[PDB]
Amino acid sequence: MIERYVEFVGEHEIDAIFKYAEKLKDLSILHVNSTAAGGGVAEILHRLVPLMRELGLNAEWKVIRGSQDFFTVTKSFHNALQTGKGEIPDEYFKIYDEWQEINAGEIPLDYDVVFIHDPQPAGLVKYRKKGTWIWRCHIDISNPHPKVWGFLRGYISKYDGMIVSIPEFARDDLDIPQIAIPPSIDPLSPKNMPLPQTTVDRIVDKFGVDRERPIILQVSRYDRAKDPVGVIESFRLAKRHVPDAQLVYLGSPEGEVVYRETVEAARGEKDVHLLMLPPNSHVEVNAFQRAATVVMQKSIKEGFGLTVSEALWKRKPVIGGNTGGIRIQVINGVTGFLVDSPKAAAYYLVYLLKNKKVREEMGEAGRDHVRRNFLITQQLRRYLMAILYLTKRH
Numbered sequence: 428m429i430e431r432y433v434e435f436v437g438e439h440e441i442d443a444i445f446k447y448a449e450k451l452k453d454l455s456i457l458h459v460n461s462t463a464a465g466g467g468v469a470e471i472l473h474r475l476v477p478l479m480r481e482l483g484l485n486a487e488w489k490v491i492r493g494s495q496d497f498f499t500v501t502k503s504f505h506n507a508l509q510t511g512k513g514e515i516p517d518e519y520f521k522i523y524d525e526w527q528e529i530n531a532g533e534i535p536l537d538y539d540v541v542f543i544h545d546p547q548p549a550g551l552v553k554y555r556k557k558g559t560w561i562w563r564c565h566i567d568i569s570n571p572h573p574k575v576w577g578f579l580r581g582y583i584s585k586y587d588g589m590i591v592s593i594p595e596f597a598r599d600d601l602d603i604p605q606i607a608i609p610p611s612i613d614p615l616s617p618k619n620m621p622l623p624q625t626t627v628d629r630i631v632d633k634f635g636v637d638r639e640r641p642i643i644l645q646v647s648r649y650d651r652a653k654d655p656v657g658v659i660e661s662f663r664l665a666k667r668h669v670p671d672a673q674l675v676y677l678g679s680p681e682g683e684v685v686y687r688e689t690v691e692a693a694r695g696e697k698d699v700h701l702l703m704l705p706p707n708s709h710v711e712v713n714a715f716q717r718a719a720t721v722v723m724q725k726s727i728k729e730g731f732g733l734t735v736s737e738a739l740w741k742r743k744p745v746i747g748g749n750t751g752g753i754r755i756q757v758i759n760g761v762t763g764f765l766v767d768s769p770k771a772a773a774y775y776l777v778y779l780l781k782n783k784k785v786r787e788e789m790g791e792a793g794r795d796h797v798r799r800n801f802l803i804t805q806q807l808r809r810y811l812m813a814i815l816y817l818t819k820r821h
């Protein structure tokens with residue numbers, strides 16, 4: 428309910444949202460992504476699509492389907508786009524286009540505005556009617572595999588507009604409008620809502636973690652781009668200087684390979700808790716983020732990382748990988764610290780665990796920074812502004 432957000436962002440931002448919604452209230456809007464049960468894109472749309480409807484926008488949300496072979500091709504496309512590395516069999520491109528065709532037939536695409544989320548459904552623009560097509564990129568495309576990019580740019584160049592999470596992901600090899608809209612957290616979502624101390628305490632104890640002693644938390648998949656092995660290395664280095672400290676890695680199911688290496692890297696320290704929760708364990712993530720003393724998101728590559736703003740909103744200082752969208756959330760020395768190695772991560776863990784007053788000041792700065800920049804009302808407003816801008820130029 429948009430009324431409830433005045434508490435956080437004030438009345439001017441809400442009036443502005445109603446004003447923009449009035450101008451759009453008889454456009455048909457379709458969002459297309461690749462999972463409804465999944466990660467950050469799903470978490471955003473589950474909150475954002477309902478807010479659009481409540482403003483009287485005709486907004487729908489459809490999910491492409493595929494074989495695991497399709498999702499093997501798109502995972503590798505994802506890693507090649509972010510790392511600039513890999514060998515891509517020519518068969519991958521043929522698998523991709525086939526599942527574009529299959530999905531086009533199963534999805535009505537005749538809307539005034541079509542948002543395509545990330546590379547997986549990007550090839551649906553082949554089957555575009557009229558209307559305004561916007562490619563919403565959530566990942567780091569600053570320095571990609573030239574063959575995968577060259578290919579996807581074949582499709583991207585046919586869109587009317589493009590949204591990236593930070594300006595640094597804008598391509599000078601594209602002439603269509605490129606708009607930087609950071610993602611956001613919904614402060615009223617189960618992930619972010621206040622919890623009674625009782626519920627936090629229950630969930631922490633349930634996983635055998637001691638809330639009498641400091642908790643270092645990373646929330647992330649057991650995936651190379653989140654560097655769980657590096658995170659354990661950071662903790663191992665800090666542990667010598669903060670012996671009572673605990674690490675919680677809060678994961679969600681080649682992924683088993685990384686998890687195994689993570690178990691091996693942890694082989695020795697018994698204050699390491701490598702958890703695996705079902706993906707929709709929102710209240711458990713909430714509870715762990717609230718129980719944390721310091722949060723890490725030590726990513727190698729990261730489009731944005733909602734886990735950062737989630738932690739900052741709960742007044743937790745974040746130690747973040749010095750990459751992509753983490754940099755606009757983690758203001759070095761103010762809301763957290765940016766690090767390029769496990770060694771610097773360890774250095775800043777020890778600093779924060781030993782400097783309570785500085786931790787809490789960072790926590791306050793963190794919440795205020797999210798309040799001004801990364802609440803769902805901010806993303807919703809800029810989203811409505813992009814639609815108005817791009818529809819009026821056809």
Ligand SMILES: OC[C@H]1O[C@H](O[C@H]2O[C@H](CO)[C@@H](O)[C@H](O)[C@H]2O)[C@H](O)[C@@H](O)[C@@H]1O
Pocket residue numbers: 465466467468471505545565566592610729730731732733752
């Ligand atoms: O592209 C597939 C991945 O999409 C999600 O994450 C991306 O989008 C988030 C919201 O904009 C960003 O915070 C994040 O940095 C991006 O990688 C999803 O959460 C992942 O599980 C998928 O691999």
